[PDB]
Design a protein around this ligand. Structure first.
Ligand code: HEM
Length: 352
């Protein structure tokens, strides 16, 4: 009953999804191989992402996409995101405190996984801390757009040095308040469900492979390689933005007609034995590979650096606080999140 590409079995793609060919028609084309997915995503000239929506990079084609992304790129680099580390550490500590105060057992998803990403996003865009609580409540449920108008008005008149402030000070003439508001809305949508899914599933994956936890508190390479492997192995998004063929195009010896849609199975592409001979195995020590969990090509995840830093901080602080982290009952059923654009957990009752 659920769409083929959204079906999972544990941490893995479902058997019916595994049985699918490289490129087949489904009731829409489904690309389920690493090479074919990278071909489709890398072909931005023949495959368009296009179907409010203003500021949504996933709805832009070049040169319009190139222009808008250029203004956003500098505010998403590894070095710029490293500046948020203290605040991420603070947010994570606050949520760990909430778990510790509640005492064992506690729902890691409700108290930790579903709370961290939103708070980090508020810090990213520069929402004042006192307004952050109400900002998230209005955003999660669907005044929200009305608040952002007032936020852009402050920054345009008197620019700070944050995310919005740096854009309006340097390129205020080329970007509008409507575009800035749209960017912020889309950042909330693109960077909440994905990260919350990764926090939940990553914690469980590390519990299921507990010798691999120690990699997180090693040197920079050790920790980053651990996080990237978890990103690869879990591949939380089922698909990127649907790709529409602008013209007739031959992909994998099959003709994709103009107007037809192609869905890329990111989990299948990252389990492709052409990417890794043992792709179904979790190993935090393996050298990073060109996985497509953050996409491929011009639309590749803008929040990739933020995600890597946030997840590293989240996983590391969790076990530093709770070394004896465990499932509340060893035999408890894993509660998978299946109704959102990203795979995750709805609940994870943990003890320590
Ligand atoms: C679990 C972590 C994440 C994963 C797995 C993920 C996945 C992806 C993927 C697959 C794409 C490509 C979409 C496409 O080509 O159609 C993408 C794009 C994008 N992501 Fe993420 N994402 C994550 C976290 C974030 C975060 C935290 C942010 C916010 C800082 C973010 C912001 C964006 C934006 C703005 C785009 C559009 C880029 C463009 O179209 O040029 N993502 N993401």
């Amino acid at each position: 009953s659920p769409p083929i590409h959204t079906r999972r079995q544990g941490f893995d793609p479902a058997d019916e999804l595994r049985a699918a060919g490289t490129l087949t028609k489904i009731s829409t084309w489904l690309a389920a191989g690493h090479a074919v997915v990278r071909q489709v995503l890398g072909d931005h000239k023949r495959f368009s992402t296009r179907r409010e929506l203003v500021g949504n990079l996933m709805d832009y084609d070049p040169p319009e996409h190139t222009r808008l992304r250029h203004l956003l790129t500098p505010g998403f680099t590894q070095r710029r995101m490293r500046r948020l580390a203290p605040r991420i550490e603070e947010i994570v500590t606050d949520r760990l405190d909430a778990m510790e105060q509640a005492g064992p057992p506690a729902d890691l998803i409700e108290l930790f996984a579903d709370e961290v990403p939103g708070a980090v996003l508020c810090e990213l865009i520069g929402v004042p801390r006192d307004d952050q609580a109400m900002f998230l409540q209005l955003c999660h449920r669907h005044a929200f757009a009305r608040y952002l108008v007032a936020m852009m008005a402050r920054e345009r008149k008197d620019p700070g040095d944050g995310f919005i402030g740096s854009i309006v000070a340097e390129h205020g003439d080329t970007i509008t308040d409507e575009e800035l508001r749209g960017v912020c809305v889309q950042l909330m949508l693109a960077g909440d469900d994905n990260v919350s899914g990764m926090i939940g599933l990553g914690v469980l994956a590390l519990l299921r492979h507990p010798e691999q936890i120690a990699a997180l508190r090693g040197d920079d390479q050790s920790a980053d390689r651990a996080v990237d492997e978890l990103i690869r192995y879990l591949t939380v998004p089922y698909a990127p933005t649907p790709r529409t063929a602008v013209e007739d195009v031959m992909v994998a010896d099959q003709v994709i007609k103009e107007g037809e849609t192609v869905l890329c199975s990111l989990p299948m592409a990252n389990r492709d034995r052409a990417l890794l001979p043992d792709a179904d195995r979790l190993d935090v020590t393996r050298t990073p590979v060109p996985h497509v969990a953050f996409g491929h090509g011009i639309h590749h995840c803008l929040g990739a650096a933020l995600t890597r830093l946030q997840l590293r901080i989240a996983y590391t602080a969790l076990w530093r606080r709770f070394p004896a982290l465990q499932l509340a009952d060893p035999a408890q059923e894993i509660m998978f999140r299946t109704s959102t654009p990203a795979y995750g957990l709805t609940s994870l009752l943990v003890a320590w």
